[PDB]
Amino acid sequence: NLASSLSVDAPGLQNQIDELSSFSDAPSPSVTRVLYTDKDVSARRYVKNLMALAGLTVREDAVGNIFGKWDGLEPNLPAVATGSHIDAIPYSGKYDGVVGVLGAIEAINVLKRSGFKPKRSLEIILFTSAEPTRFGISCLGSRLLAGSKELAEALKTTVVDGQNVSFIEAARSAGYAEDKDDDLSSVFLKKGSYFAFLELHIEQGPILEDEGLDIGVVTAIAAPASLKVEFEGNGGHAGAVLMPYRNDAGLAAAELALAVEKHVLESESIDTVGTVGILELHPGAINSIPSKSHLEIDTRDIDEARRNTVIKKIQESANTIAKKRKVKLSEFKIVNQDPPALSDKLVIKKMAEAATELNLSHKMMISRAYHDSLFMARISPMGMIFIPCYKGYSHKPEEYSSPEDMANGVKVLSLTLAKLSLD
Amino acid sequence: NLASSLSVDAPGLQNQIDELSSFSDAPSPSVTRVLYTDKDVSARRYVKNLMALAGLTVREDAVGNIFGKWDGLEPNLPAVATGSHIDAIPYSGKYDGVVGVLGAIEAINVLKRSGFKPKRSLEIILFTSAEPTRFGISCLGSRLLAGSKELAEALKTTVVDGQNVSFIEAARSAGYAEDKDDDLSSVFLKKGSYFAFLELHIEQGPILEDEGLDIGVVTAIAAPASLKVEFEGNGGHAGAVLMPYRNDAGLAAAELALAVEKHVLESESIDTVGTVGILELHPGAINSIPSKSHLEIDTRDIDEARRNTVIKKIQESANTIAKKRKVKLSEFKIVNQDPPALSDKLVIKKMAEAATELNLSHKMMISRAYHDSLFMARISPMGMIFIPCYKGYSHKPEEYSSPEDMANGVKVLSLTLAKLSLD
Numbered sequence: 001n002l003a004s005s006l007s008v009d010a011p012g013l014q015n016q017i018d019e020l021s022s023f024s025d026a027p028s029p030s031v032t033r034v035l036y037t038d039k040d041v042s043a044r045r046y047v048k049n050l051m052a053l054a055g056l057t058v059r060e061d062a063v064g065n066i067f068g069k070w071d072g073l074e075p076n077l078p079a080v081a082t083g084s085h086i087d088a089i090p091y092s093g094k095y096d097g098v099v100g101v102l103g104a105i106e107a108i109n110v111l112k113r114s115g116f117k118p119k120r121s122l123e124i125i126l127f128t129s130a131e132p133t134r135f136g137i138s139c140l141g142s143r144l145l146a147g148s149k150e151l152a153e154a155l156k157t158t159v160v161d162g163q164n165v166s167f168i169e170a171a172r173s174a175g176y177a178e179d180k181d182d183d184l185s186s187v188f189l190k191k192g193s194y195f196a197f198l199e200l201h202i203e204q205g206p207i208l209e210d211e212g213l214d215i216g217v218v219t220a221i222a223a224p225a226s227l228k229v230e231f232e233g234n235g236g237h238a239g240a241v242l243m244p245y246r247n248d249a250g251l252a253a254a255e256l257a258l259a260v261e262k263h264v265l266e267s268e269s270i271d272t273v274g275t276v277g278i279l280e281l282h283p284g285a286i287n288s289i290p291s292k293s294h295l296e297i298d299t300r301d302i303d304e305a306r307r308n309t310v311i312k313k314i315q316e317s318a319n320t321i322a323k324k325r326k327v328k329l330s331e332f333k334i335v336n337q338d339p340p341a342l343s344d345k346l347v348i349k350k351m352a353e354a355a356t357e358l359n360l361s362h363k364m365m366i367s368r369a370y371h372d373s374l375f376m377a378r379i380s381p382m383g384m385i386f387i388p389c390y391k392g393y394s395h396k397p398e399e400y401s402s403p404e405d406m407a408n409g410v411k412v413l414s415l416t417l418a419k420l421s422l423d
Numbered sequence: 424n425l426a427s428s429l430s431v432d433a434p435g436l437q438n439q440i441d442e443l444s445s446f447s448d449a450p451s452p453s454v455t456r457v458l459y460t461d462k463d464v465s466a467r468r469y470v471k472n473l474m475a476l477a478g479l480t481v482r483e484d485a486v487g488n489i490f491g492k493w494d495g496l497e498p499n500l501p502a503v504a505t506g507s508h509i510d511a512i513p514y515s516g517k518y519d520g521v522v523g524v525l526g527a528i529e530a531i532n533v534l535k536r537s538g539f540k541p542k543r544s545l546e547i548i549l550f551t552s553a554e555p556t557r558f559g560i561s562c563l564g565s566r567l568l569a570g571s572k573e574l575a576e577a578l579k580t581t582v583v584d585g586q587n588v589s590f591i592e593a594a595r596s597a598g599y600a601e602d603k604d605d606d607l608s609s610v611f612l613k614k615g616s617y618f619a620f621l622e623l624h625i626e627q628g629p630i631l632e633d634e635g636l637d638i639g640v641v642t643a644i645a646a647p648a649s650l651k652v653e654f655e656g657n658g659g660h661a662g663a664v665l666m667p668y669r670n671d672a673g674l675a676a677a678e679l680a681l682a683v684e685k686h687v688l689e690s691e692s693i694d695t696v697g698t699v700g701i702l703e704l705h706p707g708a709i710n711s712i713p714s715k716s717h718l719e720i721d722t723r724d725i726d727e728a729r730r731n732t733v734i735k736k737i738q739e740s741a742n743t744i745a746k747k748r749k750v751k752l753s754e755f756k757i758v759n760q761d762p763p764a765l766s767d768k769l770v771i772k773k774m775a776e777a778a779t780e781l782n783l784s785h786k787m788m789i790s791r792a793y794h795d796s797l798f799m800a801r802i803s804p805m806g807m808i809f810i811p812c813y814k815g816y817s818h819k820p821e822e823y824s825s826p827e828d829m830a831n832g833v834k835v836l837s838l839t840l841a842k843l844s845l846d
């Protein structure tokens with residue numbers, strides 16, 4: 001039967017993971033690969049070549065989402081889609097996102113070796129970017145596929161990176177958005193245009209490893225939000241301005257960072273998280289009192305309302321701190337505040353069947369990280385396959401998933417794609 | 424007499440201040456000009472051109488201290504020296520340092536127009552750098568002039584900037600330190616090689632302005648120190664690492680910054696200051712928990728012992744915070760910890776006499792900022808002339824001293840140089 005015939009080239013997949021990690025602005029073992037940069041362009045070509053070698057028909061949309069299709073026996077039907085991203089935040093690992101892209105191509109190669117003949121077409125999606133590094137916008141590609149008019153409008157009119165390079169200029173530099181007359185609405189997919197969407201991904205947590213399980217069947221994705229905060233003071237000479245006359249924007253930021261921690265812990269749930277991953281002082285000189293501070297805050301919960309309470313408290317603390325410190329709260333912006341998504345019940349059932357037929361132990365579990373799957377769920381039934389990762393590490397170079405774990409995930413992906421294709 | 428004949432080109436001096444401010448990595452009205460960068464080189468050339476126009480013998484030492492001498496009638500005597508710096512910390516003003524360099528050149532021209540005949544030679548010094556911006560080392564030039572073997576060794580062996588450019592490579596890109604067999608001891612001046620050293624400088628405080636006085640005669644310089652601190656944690660994924668398992672280096676840094684403020688305030692003296700001017704997070708991504716944080720701390724007091732107590736407490740707090748946060752205190756480095764200095768009493772005498780002869784009001788006062796004068800005081804009798812500045816502002820673009828105030832400082836400098844030269 002099909003399950004018993006599935007064979008992955010595990011060392012070969014690992015070789016591709018290692019090769020792709022070479023396209024990086026950080027020295028190995030770290031990876032940095034930001035949307036539309038030269039390293040991103042080289043990684044795209046590498047992946048598109050693999051898609052072509054796998055016999056896929058390759059196309060790209062206006063923002064550089066890349067699609068590789070294996071035409072089915074009934075090609076007019078909504079296809080079964082799978083994929084992930086290949087961008088990497090500064091000094092991160094080689095497996096986040098990449099496993100679900102290279103592993104999806106390997107799943108196609110695995111199904112072909114087994115002589116599987118899809119009824120519904122299978123389509124692999126390389127999402128143009130999932131990480132918010134360049135423009136502050138996470139899942140830029142999938143948010144657009146899911147039809148966000150507000151994002152399309154923003155990308156055309158206002159969005160720039162930290163070097164004031166516009167989204168359009170950056171996209172065009174990479175070979176995309178070459179139609180001046182496109183409001184980017186051309187990227188939008190109709191609801192139901194895919195029968196289902198699957199994403200293979202490392203767990204980014206220690207659960208599967210700690211429990212000794214092979215596969216996680218994802219049931220939902222937690223609700224993510226991000227905030228940008230700026231404080232402004234008078235600054236001046238660190239040696240000469242006596243303490244009673246100061247309004248130190250850096251100390252306001254320090255206090256807000258600690259308040260973020262406090263409000264997260266106030267939720268009384270271990271599922272609530274909040275982080276200050278960016279805190280910048282201006283002018284940023286040892287002997288200059290900071291006159292501006294900038295914080296970027298990530299906060300999430302499986303419960304949307306509980307997360308929103310944290311956000312409201314953070315805003316209250318930012319105002320209280322500004323008044324006490326005598327600084328201006330010059331910016332408090334909610335960059336995104338998104339709902340959680342539920343995986344489709346029939347997709348979950350097929351994934352769990354797949355794991356069982358492959359003799360792979362599994363559990364149903366929630367994803368704490370967000371993924372392109374979060375937005376694809378607005379377009380079609382969605383599910384995710386988690387594989388174990390070492391100590392749960394992710395977003396750091398110690399991130400690791402074994403060749404066998406990756407192959408197990410690929411086999412589950414192949415078998416779930418096959419079940420959905422032959423609905 | 425000499426005093427009544429002194430005449431400054433006030434608008435011309437202002438014009439040169441404005442021109443020099445154009446050599447900047449920050450857009451007007453802010454100035455950024457860092458040691459050995461292209462902007463620094465351009466500004467050095469501008470000043471050397473002015474020195475040559477004033478008829479001075481111009482020479483440079485191995486690190487780029489620039490000397491401009493007017494030969495006296497008795498040239499073998501130790502010369503009377505004056506000068507300042509022209510480097511500028513990020514987003515600062517146009518007057519800090521620059522007034523005492525361009526004003527020193529104007530003082531020579533003032534004396535020449537009056538037909539002054541020096542006995543002792545007069546020498547203007549453009550110190551290669553006073554600001555710690557590039558290498559974390561303040562007064563790099565004058566520390567070397569004052570014979571710091573420890574500094575000379577570090578500069579040749581370990582010192583690099585934040586882009587990992589070595590001191591030697593940076594120096595060489597600007598045309599300095601080209602001799603491979605110089606251990607930089609060639610820069611050292613013998614004690615007593617100058618008869619005296621004077622620095623004209625904006626007050627960087629509101630005292631002269633608030634009291635309606637023309638000139639500050641500086642009697643002492645406060646004791647400066649700086650610390651470099653790093654915390655190390657595990658970092659990881661901002662969404663997936665639950666709060667109980669974190670060791671957030673960013674929150675360690677936040678807590679240490681607030682502790683700095685606390686320990687400064689505990690001194691019970693208004694003369695004590697401390698600042699966290701630099702606080703950086705690594706990797707510095709919104710969705711990555713900081714695994715490293717870096718603080719640069721400035722702390723000073725007129726009383727050295729009180730200053731040292733703040734430092735000891737800051738180090739105790741850093742260890743306590745590291746243990747509580749479960750992070751590693753991976754670096755705690757006292758970059759410098761320098762004693763205060765006293766101005767020479769006969770230099771003070773001549774300066775106060777000069778101000779009175781020019782019908783200028785004056786008061787005795789302390790410098791809270793540090794200056795090259797702090798280290799020149801190790802080589803020779805030292806003094807400083809303060810001029811008033813708007814609202815006391817410094818290290819920001821609102822920094823301002825009027826053409827008349829600068830001219831007053833120049834005349835006091837001219838007359839004080841003349842008294843010292845003829846002594």
Ligand SMILES: NC(=O)N[C@@H](O)C(=O)O
Nearest residue numbers: 096131369370371662710
């Ligand atoms: N899968 C994943 O790590 N997405 C992240 O970029 C995130 O912050 O959730």
Ligand SMILES: NC(=O)N[C@@H](O)C(=O)O
Nearest residue numbers: 239287519554792793794
């Ligand atoms: N004069 C002066 O401002 N020196 C400064 O750079 C300082 O921090 O003291």
Ligand SMILES: [Mn+2]
Nearest residue numbers: 096097131395
């Ligand atoms: Mn990620």
Ligand SMILES: [Mn+2]
Nearest residue numbers: 096097130371
């Ligand atoms: Mn990912």
Ligand SMILES: [Mn+2]
Nearest residue numbers: 519520554818
């Ligand atoms: Mn300064």
Ligand SMILES: [Mn+2]
Nearest residue numbers: 519520553794
């Ligand atoms: Mn200065």
